[PDB]
Symmetry: C4
Subunit: 221 residues, 4 copies
Amino acid sequence: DVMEHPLVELGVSYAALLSVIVVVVEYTMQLSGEYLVRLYLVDLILVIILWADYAYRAYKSGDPAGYVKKTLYEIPALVPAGLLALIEGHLAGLGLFRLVRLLRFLRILLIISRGSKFLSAIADAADKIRFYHLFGAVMLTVLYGAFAIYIVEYPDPNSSIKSVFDALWWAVVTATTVGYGDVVPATPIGKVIGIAVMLTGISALTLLIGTVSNMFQKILV
Amino acid sequence: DVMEHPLVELGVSYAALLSVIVVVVEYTMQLSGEYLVRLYLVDLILVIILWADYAYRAYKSGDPAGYVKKTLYEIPALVPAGLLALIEGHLAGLGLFRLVRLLRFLRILLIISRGSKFLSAIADAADKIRFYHLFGAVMLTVLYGAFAIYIVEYPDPNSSIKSVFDALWWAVVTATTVGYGDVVPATPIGKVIGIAVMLTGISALTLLIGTVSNMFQKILV
Amino acid sequence: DVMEHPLVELGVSYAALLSVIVVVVEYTMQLSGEYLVRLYLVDLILVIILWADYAYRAYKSGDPAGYVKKTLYEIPALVPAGLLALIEGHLAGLGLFRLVRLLRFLRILLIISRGSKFLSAIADAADKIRFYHLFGAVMLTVLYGAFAIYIVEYPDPNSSIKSVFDALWWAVVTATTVGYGDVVPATPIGKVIGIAVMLTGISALTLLIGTVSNMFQKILV
Amino acid sequence: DVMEHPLVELGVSYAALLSVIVVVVEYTMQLSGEYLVRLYLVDLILVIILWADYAYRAYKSGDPAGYVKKTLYEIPALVPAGLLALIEGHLAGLGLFRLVRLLRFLRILLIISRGSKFLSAIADAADKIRFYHLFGAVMLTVLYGAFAIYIVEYPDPNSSIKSVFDALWWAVVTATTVGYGDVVPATPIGKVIGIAVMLTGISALTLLIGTVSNMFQKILV
């Protein structure tokens, strides 16, 4: 009786995407420390989910020593930026330029690690059983991308989307292929996730068409 | 020869949704009394429909005493706010703070009552016979949501949609998935009903696709 | 070897719709006489098509005296406003108020006549043979509505669409369900024809879906 | 082992469309010489592809003397404007008005030549084997039109789209039938290619619907 429901690997893919989101977060412009470390808070939240999923990777014991070793390949993902940047500030208090460059290379390594973890999660999700389950899965991906746009922009200045729930607004707008126009990312990676959510609303529409053909052949009954 | 046509339970669902609309209406910002009591007028109009539907619930006689008793559960819905707020003003003339709080709790109870009545109407509509009847039913829901947006915004200030028929305009815009952009709720619950009308235009599109497959298999003939 | 191609009754429906357009034209605000009589020119153009179609109604001879009599019911349609308003100005030079009111009633009668002629043309088009012919017919209706929006707005002031080809632009925008937003009628009957073109682009989309199912069952081959 | 993959004739159609694009480029307003000759650079790039494709037309030898002769009909396409306009400037240094008119007629001839080459490439693409290959082909046409809008506007002033990747942005917007509204050609031939990309996103949607029916009949399995 553990986390193995379809919704489980759903949340798995979700957390992987969110780790990619944190990756995006790490490199950024010069930002306000308050919302910066707020993002850090959300990132530590996600590292908790990292703990959970990588725990489920093993059987909660160390006897899978081989996967433990492969976990070492992907434990850089589990490494938290909240701690990394703080130790960075400590070193700055010490005065270690080359060590700061070393930590930057470490940041890039963690980046690539979380990206590969994303690859893994997306593959396993692609190997899910029920394509009827897509009914939920799509909406799930949708609200996810909503949260993700929120992440990237809610602290981002001059976005005009600084309020929260409006994330859901513009999101469903997109998923519904509206384009009300008063709200849009207007930032490069914002528009990247825009590509994401656009193909997403596409897929949603497609699922709707599939449900249409379903209801057709069934109103035949 | 009574009200039992499919259009009847249609108007039933319609009135239930509109009661939810009035519920929304009750709590609001500080508003102009004129349009406020205009909303009250429309609400009394709807209470007339409440009278009609709850009359049809019984056989116009009191022998269904059990449903009469269950009507007592849902007669708070039939209670009019036009009268409630006026008796509230009377009590204010009297100076009864705690009694005003009591009437506020009464308002919340009426809220929940009308919500449950909505639940009932939506279930019974979900148990309707002809899914071909959806052809009309969708357009009906559409023009309804049009009227509802009108309700929430036509008196609402700075909406830029203060004119009437423009309700129909933005509505069909949505149902047609246009998003002309010059017109949008820009209010929280306005955007909520926006979610509503958006999934609604979605459903409309879906019905259109179903008609497409129909016309396809029939041009095969 | 006369005008009996499907494209013929196509242009028939087209001219009927355009007569309705002229009807719209007649009543209007106080307008610039130049573009006013330019509309009059286009209207006389259409009355030529009225001559053509009502000629085709008979066999170019008067032996169909009964349809000649029924043509008298619908010859008010053939009556030109270019001549009517000019005789109106003549009477104004004479000073005949009540006769001007009489001519206004005459205008209303011509209105209703052209409306019924529209009814006839639309019925006969509804009785067309090939629903494959819809492939063209839809695009035809589309470019028509384009021209019609042009009619109503190109002279209409402050529309921001005073340029010509932009009619085609906003039209295809609609038919493609774009809503670029920089261009919109912003006038009551403009938005009416907007409803028209919106359901039109809907129908276009539907035809596209039908072609989709066609190409599907044929790529099966 | 030569260029004969489906992607090959894909790039063929692509280069033909781009030659049409250069044709558009040639006649234009008075423009900044820097971006002007930048367009010239891209055009010489395309003339290299002209060399490649017309080489593949023969077997890299002159024994197909007949097609060599027909290549003479279409070698004006291979003629570069980068060289033509430069020789034009040389003649201007000489003072040869009538010869400049002659070169203008030559420009028109090259125009028509590249147009016919486009006709040829589009026909041969229409005779492609796999309509499953459309899955890629559509996206390919899409990103092409993206690049093309970029060509026509990125140097074009006051477009508000002077930045590069935003080409991809507005493109996918269109292909996804969004219309975010902050970005649009607002130029005549810009809107022409807009028609192009609009019917293109239409076709994309249609392909998506086909994939929908596919996934439907396969989830039946």
